[PDB]
């Protein structure tokens, strides 16, 4: 099946997904003298005070932290988005390398980690139907640079030990994820696509500015995780990002002067 390998990563993907070379794919590289202002963009309303997260997952490609969704706890609206979405999981793609693991580029340039926090528009009732819909997610995209650690992402690399291979599961709850947001919402969106297969058309992605800086120590711990199950042969999981797609027809705009 599909992954991060030469056999079976990026390039090969179209085979089993052909909208991989669709017109709508992710991520792209943010050129900061294309993107244009738009006045017309309101500032974006983080609402997670009470989200309630739930476990933190292994899938094999990655780790992902899942939060209850069953109703208006923690949500996103206001940017570029009509509605109200509402957060189901987040996840990191990083490198082997500190100078290289980011999705998405500002001017060509990587950093070593990206945070995806994954939202889907409540018009549509579940995350299922979200998925057939051009409006249907929302994903909240937060650059990591290695410098200072952050206390808030402690937590998370305290338990990465115990989901260190594919399947694996842990209890999370009680999870605060105001504590990875930097200090601006400043941003850019563009109209794009998950970033994994199956590679939807779906969404409004909403990348800001400002990057958030973790340690070298913490970074490190995401590389000690396994892409294989327990009792299979070793693959550390590193290097989970697609390279930049094609702009194409589209416009990305920015919040900020
Ligand atoms: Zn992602």
Redesign the pocket.
């Known amino acids: 099946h599909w992954g991060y390998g030469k056999h079976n990563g990026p390039e090969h993907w179209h085979k089993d997904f052909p909208i991989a070379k669709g017109e709508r794919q992710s991520p792209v590289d943010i050129d900061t003298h294309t993107a244009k202002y738009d006045p017309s963009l309101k500032p974006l309303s983080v609402s997670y005070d009470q989200a309630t997260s739930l476990r933190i997952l292994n899938n094999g490609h990655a780790f992902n932290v899942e939060f209850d969704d069953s109703q208006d706890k923690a949500v996103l609206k206001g940017g570029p988005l009509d509605g109200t979405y509402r957060l189901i999981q987040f996840?990191?793609?990083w490198g082997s390398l500190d100078g290289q693991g980011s999705?998405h580029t500002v001017d060509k340039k990587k950093y070593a980690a990206?945070l995806?926090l994954?939202h889907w528009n409540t018009k549509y009732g579940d995350f299922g139907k979200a998925v057939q819909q051009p409006d249907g997610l929302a994903?909240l995209?937060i650059f990591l640079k290695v410098g200072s650690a952050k206390p808030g992402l402690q937590k998370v690399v305290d338990v990465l030990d115990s989901i260190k291979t594919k399947g694996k599961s842990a209890d999370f709850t009680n999870f605060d994820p105001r504590g990875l947001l930097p200090e601006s919402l400043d941003y850019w969106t563009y109209p794009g696509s998950?970033?994994?297969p199956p590679l939807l058309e779906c969404v409004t992605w909403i990348v800001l500015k400002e990057p958030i800086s973790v340690s070298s120590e913490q970074v490190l711990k995401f590389r000690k995780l396994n892409f294989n199950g327990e009792g299979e042969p070793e693959e550390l999981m590193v290097d989970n990002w697609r390279p930049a797609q094609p702009l194409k027809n589209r416009q990305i705009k920015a919040s900020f002067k």
């Open positions: 996840h990191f793609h999705e990206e995806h994954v994903v995209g998950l970033t994994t």
